[PDB]
Design a protein around this ligand. Structure first.
Ligand SMILES: Nc1nc2c(ncn2[C@@H]2O[C@H](COP(=O)(O)OP(=O)(O)OP(=O)(O)O)[C@@H](O)[C@H]2O)c(=O)[nH]1
Ligand SMILES: Nc1nc2c(ncn2[C@@H]2O[C@H](COP(=O)(O)OP(=O)(O)O)[C@@H](O)[C@H]2O)c(=O)[nH]1
Ligand SMILES: [Mg+2]
Lengths: 260, 436, 113, 283, 23, 429
């Protein structure tokens, strides 16, 4: 007798979600030898151990351990999820032709200094409905804020970098889309975000050249992280300032100016 | 490195330690103040930042007379205030009281001191214990300390130069009881047990040293001579160097069979010496004399398991081999059929240092023997007959039982050491195909 | 160096061990392990007489000799002096055989430190 | 090789592999050798040797051999060297084709040695094997239920040696013994020289007086009953006669009676005449 | 390093010294 | 062609110490490490046994092994002890206790990695390693077990090199260890398996030599080991100096080993003269041959009369001509054809080297693969059976970790070895 372990990678029962979102997972409710025949036809066993590195023989076949730059880190606990579980978010999903977010109150008069950072913190969610609520609320607040998004720019940096550092391709792509929407929300948003390039751009550098004669028949989802990174960089240059190009060049070295 | 921590338990252990430490100090040029007016001492003496040399010893006793004598003796400045453990009340010659009542209230700090020497000793070789199993503290506290040392330090070498009850005249009457119980405790928890009874020492002093009135001082001087001979291999340069663990395997054939005999030569006085040319062959013959053994057991009364010869001085391996060949040519001494080799030899260049006022005339060469033989079972059989005669009549059982000891422990000791007797019998038995 | 006893070269029977006795048979501990691997192989007046000649003394710690000296240097770009003398106090600790120099000026307006 | 793969019965791990590499076509042309004309190795063939990873299996070794052969023209001959000194050959049937890789022979440096060995070594091994069977437990306890003789009995301890009669004089305590000058018979180990560390007492000089001692006509070599004083001894219920060594020793004090047990071990010589049935005196 | 002229009274002369390293 | 040497246990350590002092004397190297010789020839091949440092010192390519640092201390206290490199000293806390198990599996294994590291460093320091030398005793704990472990782990690291062992075999009548048969079996079934040529010393043959040949009154281990040092110098004299008919270590191996398992040799040195009888000797090639093939001059306790010479080799040193060496080596075979096996002609290799030992007009070292090694193997195996039947002293090994199957197969291998020595001794054409 024995046990079966079916392959569950990239399936409905994939435990990657569970092991990357620790706070999530729950529902809405919490022998002989040549002894005289020595000959020039034999050698000793190669020394391929890691300790053999930088020696007479050298490393051999001892590769260094990977730094885990592409390794998918664990998502930190989210104040947005905690606040929604507490019951402080004036949002609820409405189901129809396309799922949408319905608000308690007009988005125009909400205190953005409170609400926008929470929604931007909630982008890291990997379980519905938290992910959908956070991202759709981010989009709604960005498109209905007007001039109320500019003072919240300093407060949005921590959620963006925290979500980007997770190295999750889906989270990174969603944050890139939300960043594009944020940049195209007001004239001075890019100007305010220029000084913050040093805390947002490193992840874009890491995922700049990551993609996943034949076309990608599915690209309406815009899951190409590298393409999204390039589009965000071009948008930042376009709706940025004079120092935007030099800051972006200082962060990502392989970038090209779109205005010069 | 190469340290050998000395432990001296009880009165016999303390006096033997006094004698052997005097011998070690005179051999290494260390005065009782502890300063060398000149690093072979490092094995026995630990250096201090002030240049003085503190012995790697622990004088443990349950009664304060002997340790107070040490504190008021010549080497008071040499010996540490600690490492000189004194109890408040004697063991009253009772193994049960030395092992079950006063043993606990002193063995904790005794082990603390043992650790304070062991951590200092960076190359520790083993523990050389000195006690008399016939007494109360040396038996009980000795067994307790041996058990604790075994469970703490693991497989460290443990040479117990133990003084056993004499065949016919004894210090006490409960001495067979203490001997049987102590041997029961140590069979498992000691490495090599060394016979040091007083009869043969007295006989050698009276016959070869021309001493009409031998005493404990002469006994302890001979014991110190033997200890120095065995331990000088790692202290001084020599042709053949052997450590504490080197003769472990060469001398212990089976785990239960570790009791071994001793003999020193030449045990000669000044007047006797200038009439004798002490050659290697002559000293080896005097070693293999049944009289020359430091134990009142006849090695001719049985087989020889394995002999170890520590030569010291100007001995040459040529003459050592000649002596081994000429002693195996002898029929009067015969080895077991399963040890054709049966010999270990270790040669050290350093001659034995003569103690001022001592009874041993110094010689250019002296050889000691540590030997396992089947004939050692005579003392076990005799002490068992004594213990049996008393235990059938239930003499002195109330003392031991009221001293926190189970009454069945006497029976367990008797059974297991009888198993030791029969083990000696059947290892002395010859090899015949009917055994298979 | 080269003598009769060293004249014989090393042949199987031409070496005499008893000729060359080591002064001490004690075996010096060259090789030592520091319990963490790391194998390793390796004031003028004598203290006895200095203590004998001073019965009241026990240790030489904090028992330096106080001396007074001066060092002179040529000064070329000054205004009033051309050859300056700087005064020093010497502490010669006998226990360690150690010398210490401390600068001590003379007048209040010395200008030195 | 494609499916000829056999797993050797031996447990020798593969160690390395040598390729008798053969130079390129243009190299052969500029040396003057025709590549098309290729038991003796070609003059340009060179033994370029490569090594195997630590703890590699036979599958890994054969995969490495195939990887070495992957060169279209170079390899013609492969020698997979194992840990026992053997090498498996991996020759090319045709040097100009890849797929014709095949094993031909597996030579060993001990081949003929073992071939002529397994006629006498097996007999000696079979003879020696029952001797190695343990006769005791882990401790001294013998396995069989048959009782061993009383080991400390005098008739077992002193079979060929005079007993240690004890005397109080010379001691003020219990007597121990006195060592005896007596020597063993000259039994030199077989095949060794007469190597002596020093001048030794020759055993021929001390041949026992009971050797070819005239037995008179009585049938007893002994004359007076001082044989009981010096030669004959009583060991409990047994009687020992030390003159029995005269029949065991040679004129050169050499032990000629070496009784060997059927297994091959030596039976210790004895000199006990018989059991003297001592009994309580009765009327 | 060169060898000197062949010296016959030396335990360190070669057979080739005796033969031709005379100079 | 470089020789890198290892010495293990006290036996091997003092033997290697004397060997290194002998080599230093031959190459004119003082204890301080500089060169004060008297000829250029001592510099031609001084790299074989020495490496020049950035202090000018000629450091030996020697690796010292001992679980007991006491012998390390003794050699550094010796007259030539300052020659050795400090980092080549590998040592531990507790000695082997004459236990092959401790020397091979627990205490030796913890230090075998470091000794491999230092030996490899010496190996790549050498330009072209001609091979490895080893000196140890088969009766000891860290000389036998740790040395066998060293040779085993260097067979799987330099198999194309020549690894010699000048192992000191024990003797029952020279018994100075009771586990000599155990250690000897455990080390022989490893040496016959991993030593390309393993030539042996028994101390009693050396005692016989210093008794009637040398006639020394009080020869200590110094004079005792000088013979082994001399033969080690002789086996590489042709390497270290030019020769009329030179050879090297693997020359000796290939010309002395007919079958891979038959590589246990005897040794011999000549001339050796008692103190006060030089006026009677002749000191010629014939006398050198006579003392070479004399039974008492053999430094391994065996009787060549009871055996047969599978192959002998004579390494002559000194200014001699080839005709007399060839004639003597032919004449000994012709006159003792009963002791040279008939199925192989002219069993004696002859090599001629320029430089005689300092102070000797001419000399020779003898290597002999006589079939009389079988009696020593049979004796050791008999003692091994004697202890193994009662499994005496087996508890030390079993509690240290090894099992009984290794012991049984060890004696099986050794019995096969002695059986095949007998088979080839009795073989006929
Ligand atoms: N060799 C030797 N033995 C001694 C010496 N002193 C006492 N003994 C032995 O010790 C026995 C007497 O008992 P104690 O000396 O008191 O033994 P103890 O256990 O250390 O002390 P107690 O518990 O009080 O009996 C005697 O039989 C002696 O054999 C001595 O100086 N040398
Ligand atoms: N020739 C010679 N033999 C020695 C010397 N020291 C020890 N031996 C031999 O080595 C054997 C014992 O080896 P041992 O000392 O136990 O080896 P170790 O434990 O590894 O150091 C004995 O039979 C001796 O004959 C020496 O200095 N010279
Ligand atoms: Mg007392």
């Amino acid at each position: 007798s024995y046990e079966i372990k079916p392959i569950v990678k990239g399936t409905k029962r994939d435990p990657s979600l569970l092991k990357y979102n620790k706070a999530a997972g729950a529902g809405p409710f919490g022998t002989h030898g040549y002894g005289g025949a020595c000959s020039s036809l034999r050698k000793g066993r190669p020394r391929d151990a890691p300790d053999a590195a930088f020696s007479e023989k050298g490393c051999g076949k001892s590769a260094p351990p990977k730094a885990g730059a592409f390794k998918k880190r664990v998502i930190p606990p989210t104040e947005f999820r905690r606040a929604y579980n507490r019951g402080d978010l004036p949002i609820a999903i409405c189901h129809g032709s396309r799922p949408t977010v319905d608000w308690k109150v007009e988005v125009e008069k909400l205190d953005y200094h409170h609400y926008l950072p929470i929604f931007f913190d909630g982008i890291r969610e990997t379980e519905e409905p938290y992910m959908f609520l956070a991202r759709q609320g981010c989009l709604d607040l960005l498109e209905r804020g007007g001039s109320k998004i500019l003072p919240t720019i300093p407060q949005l940096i921590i959620p963006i970098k925290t979500a980007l550092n997770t190295r999750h391709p889906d989270i990174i792509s969603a944050t890139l889309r939300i960043l594009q929407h944020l940049i195209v929300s007001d004239d001075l948003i890019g100007e305010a975000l220029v000084p913050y390039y040093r805390q947002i751009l490193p992840v874009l550098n890491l995922f700049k050249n990551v993609h996943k004669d034949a076309m990608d028949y599915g690209q309406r989802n815009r899951d190409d992280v590298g393409d999204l990174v390039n589009e965000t960089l071009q948008l930042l240059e376009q709706h940025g300032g004079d120092d935007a190009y030099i800051n972006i060049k200082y962060m990502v070295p392989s970038y090209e100016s779109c205005i010069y | 490195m190469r340290e050998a921590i000395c432990i001296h338990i009880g009165q016999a252990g303390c006096q033997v330690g006094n004698a052997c430490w005097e011998l070690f100090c005179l051999e290494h040029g260390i005065q009782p103040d502890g300063s060398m007016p000149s690093d072979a001492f490092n094995t026995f003496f630990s250096e201090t930042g002030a240049g003085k040399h503190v012995p790697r010893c622990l004088f443990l006793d349950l009664e304060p007379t002997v340790v107070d004598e040490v504190r008021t003796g010549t080497y008071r400045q040499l010996f540490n205030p600690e490492q000189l453990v004194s109890g408040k009340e004697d063991a009253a010659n009772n193994y049960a009281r030395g092992h079950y009542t006063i043993g606990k209230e002193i063995v904790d700090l005794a082990l603390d001191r043992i650790r304070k020497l062991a951590d200092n000793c960076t190359g520790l070789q083993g523990f050389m214990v000195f006690h008399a199993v016939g007494g109360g503290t040396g038996s009980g506290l000795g067994a307790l300390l041996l058990e604790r040392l075994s469970v703490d330090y693991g497989k460290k070498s443990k040479l117990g130069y133990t003084v056993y009850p004499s065949p016919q005249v004894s210090t006490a009457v409960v001495e067979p009881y203490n001997c049987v119980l102590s041997t029961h405790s140590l069979l498992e928890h000691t490495d090599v047990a060394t016979m040091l009874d007083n009869e043969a020492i007295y006989d050698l002093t009276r016959r070869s040293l021309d001493i009409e009135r031998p005493s404990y001082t002469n006994v302890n001087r001979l014991i110190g001579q033997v200890v120095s001979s065995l331990t000088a291999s790692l202290r001084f340069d020599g042709a053949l160097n052997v450590d504490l663990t080197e003769f472990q395997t060469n001398l212990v054939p089976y785990p239960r069979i570790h009791f071994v005999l001793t003999s020193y030569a030449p045990v000669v006085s000044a007047e006797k010496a200038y009439h004798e040319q002490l050659s290697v062959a002559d000293i080896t013959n005097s070693v293999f004399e049944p009289a020359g053994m430091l134990t009142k057991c006849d090695p001719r009364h049985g087989k020889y398991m394995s002999c170890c010869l520590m030569y010291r001085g100007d001995v040459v391996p040529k003459d050592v081999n000649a002596a081994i060949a000429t002693i195996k040519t002898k029929r009067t001494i015969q080895f077991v059929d399963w040890c054709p080799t049966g010999f270990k030899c270790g040669i050290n260049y350093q001659p034995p240092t003569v103690v001022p006022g001592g009874d041993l005339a110094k010689v250019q060469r002296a050889v000691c023997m540590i030997a396992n033989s089947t004939a050692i079972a005579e003392v076990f059989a005799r002490i068992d007959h004594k213990f049996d005669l008393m235990y059938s009549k239930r003499a002195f059982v109330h003392w031991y039982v009221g001293e926190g000891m189970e009454e069945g422990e006497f029976s367990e000791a008797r059974e297991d050491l009888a198993a030791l007797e029969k083990d000696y019998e059947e290892v002395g038995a010859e090899s015949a195909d009917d055994m298979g | 160096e080269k003598t009769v006893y060293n004249a014989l070269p090393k042949l199987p029977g031409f070496s005499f061990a008893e000729l060359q006795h080591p002064a001490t048979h004690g075996k010096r501990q060259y090789c030592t392990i520091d319990s963490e691997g790391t194998r390793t192989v390796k004031c003028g007046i004598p203290v006895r007489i200095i203590l004998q000649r001073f019965p009241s003394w026990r240790t030489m710690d904090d028992k330096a000799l106080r001396f007074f000296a001066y060092y002179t240097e040529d000064v070329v770009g000054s205004r009033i002096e051309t050859w300056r003398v700087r005064k020093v106090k010497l502490h010669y600790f006998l226990a360690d055989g150690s010398l210490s120099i401390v600068e001590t000026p003379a007048v209040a307006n010395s200008g030195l430190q | 090789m494609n499916s000829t793969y056999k797993e050797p019965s031996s447990a020798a791990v593969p160690t390395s592999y040598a390729v008798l590499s053969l130079p390129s076509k243009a190299t052969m042309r500029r040396k003057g050798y025709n590549p098309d004309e290729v038991l003796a190795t070609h003059p340009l063939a060179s033994w370029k040797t490569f090594s195997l990873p630590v703890g590699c299996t036979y599958k890994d070794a054969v995969t490495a051999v195939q990887t070495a052969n992957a060169k279209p023209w170079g390899p013609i001959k492969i020698r997979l060297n194992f840990s026992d000194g053997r090498y498996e050959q991996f020759e090319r049937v045709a040097p100009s084709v890849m797929d014709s890789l095949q094993s031909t022979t597996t030579y060993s440096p001990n081949g003929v040695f073992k071939e002529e060995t397994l006629s006498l070594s097996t007999t000696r091994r079979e003879a020696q094997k029952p001797r190695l069977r343990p006769l005791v437990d882990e401790r001294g306890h013998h396995l069989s239920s048959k009782p061993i003789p009383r080991t400390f009995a005098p008739e077992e301890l002193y079979k060929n040696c005079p007993p240690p009669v004890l005397c109080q004089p010379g001691y003020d305590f219990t007597p121990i013994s006195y060592n005896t000058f007596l020597l063993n018979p000259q039994d030199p180990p077989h095949g060794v020289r007469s190597v002596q560390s020093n001048f030794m007492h020759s055993k021929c000089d001390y041949r026992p007086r009971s050797y070819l001692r005239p037995e008179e006509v009585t049938g007893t070599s002994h004359a007076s009953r001082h044989c009981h004083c010096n030669e004959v001894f009583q060991l409990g219920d047994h009687t020992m006669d030390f003159a029995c060594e005269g029949t065991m020793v040679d004129h050169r004090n050499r032990l000629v009676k070496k009784d060997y047990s059927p297994i091959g071990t030596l039976k210790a010589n004895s000199s006990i005449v018989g059991r003297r049935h001592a009994r309580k005196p009765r009327f | 390093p060169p060898h000197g002229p062949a010296n016959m009274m030396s335990t360190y002369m070669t057979r080739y010294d005796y033969d031709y390293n005379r100079d | 062609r470089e020789i890198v040497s290892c010495q293990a246990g006290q036996c091997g350590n003092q033997i290697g110490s004397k060997f290194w002092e002998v080599i230093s004397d031959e190459h004119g190297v003082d204890p301080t490490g500089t060169y004060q010789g008297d000829s250029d020839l001592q510099l031609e091949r001084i790299n074989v046994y020495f490496d020049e440092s950035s202090g000018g010192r000629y450091v030996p390519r020697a690796v010292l092994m001992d679980l007991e640092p006491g012998t390390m201390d003794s050699v550094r206290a010796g007259p030539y002890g300052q020659l050795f490199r400090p980092d080549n000293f590998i040592f531990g806390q507790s000695g082997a206790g004459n236990n092959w198990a401790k020397g091979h599996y627990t205490e030796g294994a913890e230090l075998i990695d470091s000794v491999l590291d230092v030996c490899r460093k010496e190996a790549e320091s050498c330009d072209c390693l001609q091979g490895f030398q080893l000196s140890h005793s088969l009766g000891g704990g860290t000389g036998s077990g740790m040395g066998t472990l060293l040779i085993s782990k260097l067979r799987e690291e330099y198999p194309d090199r020549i690894m010699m062992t000048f192992s000191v075999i024990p003797s029952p009548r020279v018994s100075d260890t009771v586990v000599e048969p155990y250690n000897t079996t455990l080390s022989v079934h490893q040496l016959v398996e991993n030593s390309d040529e393993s030539m042996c010393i028994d101390n009693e043959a050396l005692y016989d030599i210093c008794f009637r040949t040398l006639k020394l009154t009080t020869p200590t281990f110094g004079d005792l080991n000088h013979l082994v040092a001399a033969v080690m110098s002789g086996v590489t004299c042709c390497l270290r100096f030019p020769g009329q008919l030179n050879s090297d270590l693997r020359k000796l191996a290939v010309n002395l080993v007919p079958f891979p398992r038959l590589h246990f040799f005897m040794m011999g040195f000549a001339p050796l003269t008692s103190r006060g009888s030089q006026q009677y000797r002749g000191l010629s090639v014939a006398e050198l041959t006579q003392q070479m093939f004399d039974a008492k001059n053999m430094m391994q306790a065996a009787d060549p009369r009871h055996g047969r010479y599978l192959t002998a080799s004579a390494l002559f040193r000194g200014r001699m001509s080839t005709k007399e060496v060839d004639e003597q080596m032919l004449n000994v075979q012709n006159k003792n054809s009963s002791y040279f096996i008939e199925w192989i002609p002219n069993n004696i290799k002859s090599s001629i080297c320029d430089i005689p030992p300092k102070g000797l007009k001419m000399s020779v070292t003898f290597i002999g693969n006589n079939t009389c090694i079988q009696e020593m193997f049979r004796r050791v195996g008999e003692q091994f059976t004697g202890m193994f039947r009662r499994k005496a002293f087996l508890h030390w090994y079993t509690g240290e970790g090894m099992d009984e199957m290794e012991f049984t197969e060890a004696e099986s291998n050794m019995n096969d070895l002695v059986s095949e020595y007998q088979q080839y001794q009795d073989a006929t054409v």
